[PDB]
Structures are given as C-alpha cells and as structure tokens.
Amino acid sequence: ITGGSSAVAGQWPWQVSITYEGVHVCGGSLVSEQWVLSAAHCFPSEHHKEAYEVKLGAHQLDSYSEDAKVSTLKDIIPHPSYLQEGSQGDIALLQLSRPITFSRYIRPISLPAANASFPNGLHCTVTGWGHVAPSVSLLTPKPLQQLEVPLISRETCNALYNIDAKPEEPHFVQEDMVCAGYVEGGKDACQGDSGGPLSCPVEGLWYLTGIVSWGDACGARNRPGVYTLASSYASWIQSKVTELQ
Ligand SMILES: *C(=O)c1ccc(NC(=N)N)cc1
C-alpha cells in the first residue's frame, strides 16, 4: 500500500497473509471458519499446494504474536474462467487444512449478494503488507497498511488506463471488475497487496466489495487499483462452500 497509513492491530480481522515457500506473496480475506478468498493469479498451476501458508490475526508480520495463527491449505479453487493476467474470474477459494476458531483478531468478512451495488465514490478501504512504493518493500516489522479509496466505475477506469497507455499491453477493466483510487498518483495498492480486501461500509457493517487484482506501477497517475467484484461470484462461492461444508 502506497500513500496509506498503519492500521491498528485487529482493525481488519479478516485480512490474511498468504505465503509461498515461507515468503509473503499475496493478501486474502477470511470469509468463514475454513475458507479464505483471494485472487486466482496468486496461485499458478505449477506451484505446490503444500508450500502455501495462510497467516491469520496478524498485525506486524515480522513480530511474534500469540493472537496470530498459521494454517496450510486443503484445497485451492480458482474460478474456472480464469486464464491469464488481466482476464476475468481472478478469484480463488482457499480451504484451510483445518477450521480455525474466530477471535477478537480473526473474524470473517460479510460477502455481498450478486445484486449488491456499491455506489461510485463510496469511500472503501484497501489493506495489505505489499510494497509502499514501486519496488520498495514495507519495512520490518511490517505493520498492516490501510488506505481509504473511493470507488471508480470500470468505464471511467478504462478511460484513465487509456491515457498514455502502452500499446502492447491490455489494461482492460472487465465486467467483473471495479476500480478504486485517485486520478492523480500517490495512493494505491501495490505488489504484495493483491488478493486482499477492498472493504466497504454498508449499514453499520463492512462487506468484501473487491479483491485486489491488477494495475500499473502502483501510485502512478491515471492508474487506480483494479479489483474483482465479489458480487460477480456470489452464487459460485455460495455453491462451492455449501457443497464442501
Ligand atoms: C497486486 O499485487 C497489485 C494490484 C494492483 C497494482 N497496481 C495498482 N494498484 N495500480 C499492483 C499490484
């Protein structure tokens, strides 16, 4: 997260760290006792399931905490529609090897219905332990970073991404995607933040509106963060989790 600030411990109790061979690679969101939502691109097919971990209830990643819990995975389920970087269906269900117990630091985030609308300009928050500027790691002890970002429609976002665009690149915001951020630079999600939550406030609660997907160099002007809409996968998630509950 660039241009953000340190969250307080336990402020975003659904935020998880996802590691591969012990190294933080992506964020994710706890959605029940045994399921985490993240981005499909965080889990390439050649990676071994047994090499992944999920760390829950953490604030400072490098610090020891009696409140943090670490789990391995029983299953990794990317949406079948996911193909390459930038494509639709950039969402994955992760089943923990065993269910965990909720605590003051470990709590699930409510999922939006298929027809939940979050209005343009709604001030949501994106969180993560990703880079704090292009190619600059968050410094040890790595406290969780947070950033308020207003929602930006895919249509405006596509227009923004078309400004000074690299010809050879797709930067197409798909029908299952939304953006959030600022036309000017400075404040955005970065590498290491992907797969994590865009939490939006509705009727006294917080919903998982978006899963950090992709973007240009983080914090560049005309390049706000791109998110997969959880609403686009409401039915699929409910089906998968119920069959495998
Ligand atoms: C994920 O690691 C990720 C998401 C988004 C960006 N770029 C922008 N937010 N512009 C980089 C990396």
Side-chain angles (χ1 to χ4, degrees), residues 77-92:
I77 315 174
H79 198 268
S81 65
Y82 188 67
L83 297 177
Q84 321 144 49
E85 171 183 355
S87 76
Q88 72 173 34
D90 194 9
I91 187 170

Side-chain angles (χ1 to χ4, degrees), residues 2 25-27 39 41-42 130-131 161 180 187-196 211-220 222-227:
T2 192
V25 300
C26 282
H41 78 252
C42 292
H131 293 183
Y161 271 87
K187 302 190 280 186
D188 207 3
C190 309
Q191 186 59 44
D193 289 325
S194 284
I211 293 172
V212 186
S213 189
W214 60 268
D216 209 323
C218 86
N222 305 318
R223 306 292 189 261
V226 186
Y227 298 79

Side-chain angles (χ1 to χ4, degrees), residues 46-77:
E46 64 271 36
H47 277 198
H48 311 104
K49 183 173 76 197
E50 328 89 84
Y52 285 100
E53 293 193 313
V54 177
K55 184 162 174 184
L56 309 97
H59 176 51
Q60 285 168 3
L61 273 195
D62 295 344
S63 304
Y64 185 70
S65 175
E66 68 183 6
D67 305 306
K69 303 283 174 279
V70 184
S71 306
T72 47
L73 300 176
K74 191 182 171 193
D75 207 5
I76 299 168
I77 315 174

